[PDB]
Amino acid sequence: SPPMNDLNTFVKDAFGRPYIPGSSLKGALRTAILNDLKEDTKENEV
RNA sequence: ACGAGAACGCAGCACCAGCUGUCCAACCUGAAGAAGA
């Protein structure tokens, strides 16, 4: 009951195929492996 | 009316022949197009 004012399209490559882009799964895995601390983020060799 | 007069230290001759400004080296490292209530 709020109309279709805006539509956020899924990310696609040049040919129009949908695909999960880079760094998406990387962040989804960082949000798990980074369970210890918020400090070691960039220099973290993990 | 001078130990003097006359007399080019001159002629020909390529500073030239051979020789890679070359060898080794990732423009690389980390990053959720995402979240109120």
Handedness of CA A36, A41, A45, A46 (dihedral sign): positive
Resolution of the experimental structure, in angstroms: 2.6
Contacts of A46 (CB under 8 A, 6+ apart): A33, A40
Residues 6+ apart with CB under 8 A from A18: A10, A11, A12
Rounded-to-integer distance, Cα A44 and Cα A21, Å: 23
* Residues contacting A21, CB < 8 A, separation 6+: A11
Tell me which residue of A44, A11, A9, A10 sits closest to A29, measured CA to CA. A44
- Asked if residue A10 lies in contact with residue A18, where contact means CB atoms within 8 angstroms, the answer is yes
How was this one solved? Answer: cryo-EM
Residues at the strand B interface (CB under 7 A)? A 11, 21-24, 26-28, 30-31, 41-42, 44
> Ramachandran region of residue A16, left (φ > 0), alpha (ψ -120 to 50) or beta?
left
> Could you identify the residue written with the tokens 């989804």?
A28
